[PDB]
């Protein structure tokens, strides 16, 4: 993560980072 | 939209824990 | 009789009669597309004041069939830096001219004439001083010609030394070195020092037939006395006459004035006159006024023709108008026709005035007087100027308006800012109102607010400079899109954004990498320069009206390095003496320093081996015949738009996936101060190598230049090559005669061969003897000669030409 | 089976199992962010054959190629869409061939495939066969082309005419495209390239059998395509009919015109009787006061919708017919409460689409209050209010600007049917920048007068006296070079414009003279007249004449070029040139004349066993300012003279000069001239009218033809006679036509060894005929002679034998 405004590629890839693993999720089911 | 939290403003770590691990 | 004003003399001979009765010639003479419809002869003219030109003069053979006096050529206003030109002569085959004796000013020309030998049959540094900027070309090659003169002089021509002529019948005619640099007479006399060309009489200025100085009533004198005042720079008249002389007709046509005992037609730059029609200029205390007016209220400028009139005009009583919708570097030429007008008495408008992004062109505008206000009293006001960027309101500049306030309309580009800026300075602070000079459309798309680049960094090369900026992260970094570097030459620091474009482009991208700052390779400068550069950054302004900036440099001034110089140029080097040289050269084209100052070196060559084997009394000769600017439309929208068109589907995507839960020694000496360096204690007939260098100020540390060069031969030495003592005689059977003779000492390079010359009554016979032969034998044996008495002679043909004869040998053959 | 709604495939590879058993999809297919890229090759399903939505690939990291998941993808029905798009591949960062290689009909959207690094086999397959409108795909930021380098298994493959291209299609390098012959035409195929029924859409596993389709194009049902369902089976998601047993049951539905939809449409309503009965308004609800529009999908959330009570904002960038989908799903609106606003909506060429607005309330406005507002249409060229249809503004101001390509009338004749003049100042319905590049309305000016000459043209007009004579200020001329007539007022403003005003005296009409016009050109003109546009708006009427073509009369031209000859063979001379500089007309031919320059009798005067000399011995680069100043000062020299040539030079029209024209070419030959002596060829360069006005000047040059070799030698054999003091006169004749001249004679002899070697001038020859050599030595002797000619030495005579007697 980097305190600066995040967008485009390096958004996902910060986010990745922040959540890494198992964590992340858009639900079908709502 | 994500953008409009993070493209707009910043975005700090509470705005995030929402959907990590 | 001295003709009047620059005679030209188109379409027939018969029109060339003019020339019949005048003596002196004052300004050009042209002669154009004559065709012969024939024998003239114009003796009279001997002085031609400024220059002379023939063209396509058909059916004319020679210039000496015209004018066999003219003996000057003034050449005080010049045919761009010529004073002489014979160009297409189709049918010329000799310059003749034979008597031109001096032409003072300027260069000679001579080209595409089909026909035109002896052109290099001339000591043309015996005439003009700067025979580096002769221009010759196209002509017949002289390899071909004749050059057959009679055989007279000769003189040596750089590395080589042979006859001078003008003509098959005429050689140049030259003064004796005892004279010096005098004038002289046809029977060597030395003339009056103050005489020019040839004389009447020796050492009498009113026998002379030009003076160099200045002429008054028949004399020639250095400078006329008080009360004469020097006209057209050959001759003297009083202060009556040139009040009596009327100017071309002209609405400014007025007498002549004196100044500084000059009489001319008009006052030099920095004086003007007074005002008594008068004869007098004086100081100009600083600018000059003139006071230029027009027939229109208003003079309407619809593009650079319009504004010619103004030129040379500094105060305009009267309005102006500019509409230039269209046209190239218009404001270059707008700086000189009209840039110095610096006050305007009307109102000044511009309208669609399209081509124009700067009004830097009225350079010196200091007051608009107003005395012309506009509805709601205006007095400078531009409307629908769709290109116009920058008034004439940088930090180094004023103005000041009298009276009538302003308005804006229709301006993109402008600032607002930078119009609230200009109208404080004007001293209009306060005087308008909301609504004359509008917020809405003025300006309406200008990136009017930029962030600042830095340099982080800068190498510098001869002919190469390596620079890098840091890395500009506008808020939403994908609105960056490219950068834009821009220098120029730039020898001093007045310069800003809005020159021309001048500038150069280069189109250097973002970085591939994430963590290297770019930068940009300039190639292909020069040494000792000083480029300016400054960067600017391509970037995404959709919806960013307020969002994003452009980035900007400082217009950074740096300059490459120092060379070792570069070549001389033109070395041309004579011999005015034996033992002794002259040498002129022309300065390096690229000094890559501050001159320092010059290297001379010089060595003798070697006299070839090939001239002692041949025995050229027996040879011959023959005789014949027989990297880009993708700028283009690419780069306005085709890479703008393609990149607004995937920021704007990137956040479509994230916006609907992410959810959250609830042979020879050398020699060297050293130059001062100008081009040449008389060389002393050589040999008296040696050739010799020059090799000339330039050294700079960094030249010490770098080494000095490559050498120009060039082969110099000095004069012979006046009788060396001459027999040195008596010939001797010995009989031989078969009635025949030996003779040996002694060689001489020193000389002229070499003695080549000797001819004898001998017979019993008259010395009919002649032989040729090799140098070879002589060495063998000591001479030449002449056989089976007829019984009686016989007397001879006996010459020797050195490389310096001839010698002189021998005191005759007398011998005797008896038959038996 | 049918799966359920959607499908999203995410977090991991595993999760993908979900789509294990499921053949066809209502509704998207999302694969997204499998991060970790491991299992990849792990999973197989080949039981998809069709999706009805879009399908979305993002940033599965582990993926190789489509083809190991998807095989059996026959159908995208893009019966929704994803932002125009029906398929979309985005980021994926590890994918290197697409596959799919049994797709075969995609029906609705257009294809995006983007910053894909290594994706190749990119347009190397004929789009145009797979769905229709290949304009609208949108292929970008893709592996450069020629890094990779297409290819098919033998590159061997089939083909055609990719684009203009003619090449092998390839899905990917393992397999070509599977494509049958257009023998079926419309019609659908299968393996071994057999026409399937009409029905079958995509791949078909019987030939012309119903069942064996894969797909329909139009309907399923039953097991069996049709071009149309069966009766009493309601359309259900656009691909097949079911009845009340289902669309009963989905989770909260109605019906309307055999269709099964979530709610009745406009002018129909619920029922109360019986769910079904939609018996004969619909509003959108807001979220965003700026209901921002930029595409389908964007736009299809108001499809059917008659109130719309929020704020429009009009968007739309590209699109080549997108105009025909707005219209289904907007063209239902008849009431916007809130402002109206377009921007950059550069692919509007028409507001026709909302069909059925009407009113626009301002219950909210713009910063300045502004309620209707236009800017920046770069191709906008005709608004929705002709006089047939109403629109009814009731509050808020107008405005507009940067409308290039709408006609300034159409703005005031839409502000006439809105009844809103007064509310509007010059800025907001300036016509300095709405509307300066497209025609209409005009009156005609008349050219009443046109005079030319070489130079100028002088041409003047009637006097237009418009209904108010004080509205015109000026009346403007434009002009510009045309030769042909293929041009039109809005070719770029190349087009000079002039300004002129109409005299005070009323009774002279108006005119104009241009000058500093080429010669012999065509020149068109047209007029434009100014005119205050306001206070009665498109009453001020407005002025133009027709495009005029003038051609100004004419002159003369220059001459030949690179005028160069030689020799190549005896009595032959070859002569090459180029056109002149400036024709300043038609160039017709040549002219080629010669003549003789003498045998240098200059030359046979000089005696050369005399005296002679001695010999002497034995990505474009820029441009410095200085060079810019050097070069202009030789342009000035040489346009210095050749106003001298001028004054029209008119050529009206020892030896004579021979004389013949040129008939095609710039190149000619002249024969059978004397050999080795020297000539002059001179040319001059002609024009259709050098006829009349006189042919241009020469450029020339000079010539000596081929010798012939041996003519120079002796003609004869050579003769001897004895003479006193041991003497000998040798006899021989002169050579009678010599290579340009006989200029001496050379005697070799000796008594045992031709050792002896003289210089014979020509001058003793003419004398005597010969020579005499004198005071020879006792004994026999040999002897040749070589006479000199200009072309070089000849060759040695026969040898010569004489003998001096000792006695
Ligand atoms: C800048 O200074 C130079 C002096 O080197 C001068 O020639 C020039 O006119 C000045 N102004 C500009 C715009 O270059
Ligand atoms: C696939 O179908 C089989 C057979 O009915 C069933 O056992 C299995 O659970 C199904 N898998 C999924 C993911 O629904
Ligand atoms: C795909 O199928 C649709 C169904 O109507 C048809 O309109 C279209 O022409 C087909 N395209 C191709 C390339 O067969
Ligand atoms: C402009 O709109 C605002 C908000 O709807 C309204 O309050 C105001 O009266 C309007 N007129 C103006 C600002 O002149």
């Given at each position: 993560f980097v305190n600066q405004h995040l967008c485009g590629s390096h958004l996902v890839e910060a986010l990745y980072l922040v959540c890494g693993e198992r964590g992340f999720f858009y639900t079908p089911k709502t | 939209g994500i953008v409009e939290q993070c493209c707009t403003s910043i975005c700090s770590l509470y705005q995030l824990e929402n959907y990590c691990n | 009789e001295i003709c009047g004003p620059g005679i030209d003399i188109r379409n027939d001979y018969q029109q060339l009669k003019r020339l019949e009765n005048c003596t002196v010639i004052e300004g050009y003479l042209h002669i154009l597309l004559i065709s012969k419809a024939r024998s003239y002869r114009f003796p009279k003219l001997t002085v031609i004041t400024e220059y002379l030109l023939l063209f396509r003069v058909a059916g004319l053979e020679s210039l000496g069939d015209l004018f066999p006096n003219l003996t000057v050529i003034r050449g005080w206003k010049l045919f761009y830096n010529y004073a002489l030109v014979i160009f297409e002569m189709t049918n010329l085959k000799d310059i003749g001219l034979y008597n031109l004796r001096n032409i003072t000013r300027g260069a000679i020309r001579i080209e595409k004439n089909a026909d035109l030998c002896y052109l290099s049959t001339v000591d043309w540094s015996l005439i003009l001083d700067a025979v580096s900027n002769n221009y010759i070309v196209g002509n017949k090659p002289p390899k071909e010609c004749g050059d057959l003169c009679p055989g007279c002089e000769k003189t040596t021509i750089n590395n080589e030394y042979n006859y001078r002529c003008w003509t098959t019948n005429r050689c140049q005619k030259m003064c004796p070195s005892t004279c010096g640099k005098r004038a002289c007479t046809e029977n060597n006399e030395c003339c009056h020092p103050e005489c020019l060309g040839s004389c009447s009489a020796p050492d009498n200025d009113t026998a002379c037939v030009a003076c160099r100085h200045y002429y008054y009533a028949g004399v020639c004198v250095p400078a006329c006395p008080p009360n004469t005042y020097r006209f057209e720079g050959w001759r003297c008249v009083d202060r009556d006459f040139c009040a009596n002389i009327l100017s071309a007709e002209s609405s400014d046509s007025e007498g002549f004035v004196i100044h500084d005992g000059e009489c001319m037609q008009e006052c030099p730059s920095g004086f003007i006159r007074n005002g008594s029609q008068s004869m007098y200029c004086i100081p100009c205390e600083g600018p000059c006024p003139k006071v230029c007016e027009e027939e229109k209220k208003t003079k309407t400028i619809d593009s650079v023709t319009s504004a010619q009139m103004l030129q040379?005009?500094?105060?305009?009583?009267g309005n102006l108008l500019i509409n230039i919708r269209r046209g190239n570097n218009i404001a270059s030429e707008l700086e000189n026709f009209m840039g110095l007008i610096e006050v305007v008495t009307g109102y000044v408008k511009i309208r669609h005035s399209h081509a124009l992004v700067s009004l830097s062109f009225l350079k010196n505008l200091r007051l608009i007087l107003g005395e012309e206000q506009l509805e709601g009293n205006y007095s400078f006001y531009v409307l629908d100027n769709q290109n116009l960027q920058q008034l004439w309101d940088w930090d180094h500049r004023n103005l000041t308006i009298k009276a009538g306030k302003m308005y804006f309309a229709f301006n993109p580009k402008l600032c607002v800012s930078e119009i609230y800026r200009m109208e404080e300075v004007t001293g209009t602070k306060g005087r308008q109102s909301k609504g004359d000079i509008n917020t809405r459309n003025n300006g309406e798309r200008a990136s009017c607010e930029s962030d600042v680049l830095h340099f982080t960094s800068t190498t510098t090369s001869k002919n190469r400079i390596i620079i890098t900026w840091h890395r500009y992260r506008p808020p939403d970094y994908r609105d960056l899109i490219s950068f834009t570097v821009y220098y120029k030459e730039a020898p001093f620091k007045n310069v800003t954004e809005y020159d021309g474009q001048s500038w150069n482009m280069v189109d250097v991208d973002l970085p591939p990498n994430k963590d290297v700052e770019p930068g940009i390779l300039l190639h292909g400068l020069k040494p000792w320069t000083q480029y300016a550069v400054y960067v600017k950054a391509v970037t995404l302004t959709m919806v960013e009206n307020d969002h994003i900036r452009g980035a900007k440099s400082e217009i950074l001034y740096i300059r490459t390095n120092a060379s070792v110089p570069s070549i001389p140029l033109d070395v041309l080097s004579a011999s005015n003496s034996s033992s002794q040289l002259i040498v002129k050269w022309n300065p390096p084209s690229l000094p890559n320093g501050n001159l320092s100052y010059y290297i001379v070196r010089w060595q003798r060559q070697p006299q070839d081996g090939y001239l002692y084997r041949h025995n050229y009394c027996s040879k011959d000769k023959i005789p014949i015949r027989k990297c880009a600017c993708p700028k283009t439309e690419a780069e306005k929208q085709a890479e703008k738009e393609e990149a607004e068109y995937r920021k704007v589907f990137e956040n479509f995507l994230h916006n609907s996936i992410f959810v959250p839960r609830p042979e020879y020694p050398f020699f060297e000496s050293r130059v001062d101060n100008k081009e040449r360096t008389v060389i002393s204690n050589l040999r008296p007939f040696t050739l010799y190598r020059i090799d000339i260098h330039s050294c700079n100020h960094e030249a010490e540390k770098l080494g000095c230049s490559a050498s120009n060069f060039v082969f110099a031969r000095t004069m012979p030495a006046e009788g060396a090559d001459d027999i040195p003592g008596p010939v001797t005689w010995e009989p031989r059977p078969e009635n025949s005669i030996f003779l040996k003779w002694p060689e001489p000492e020193n000389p002229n390079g070499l003695i080549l061969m000797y001819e004898i010359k001998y017979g019993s009554q008259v010395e009919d016979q002649r032989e040729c003897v090799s140098r070879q032969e002589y060495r063998k034998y000591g001479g030449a044996k002449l056989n089976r000669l007829n019984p009686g008495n016989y007397t001879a002679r006996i010459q020797a043909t050195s490389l310096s030409g001839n010698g002189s004869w021998t005191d005759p040998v007398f011998f005797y053959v008896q038959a038996k």
């Open positions: - | - | 040379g005009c500094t105060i305009f009583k």
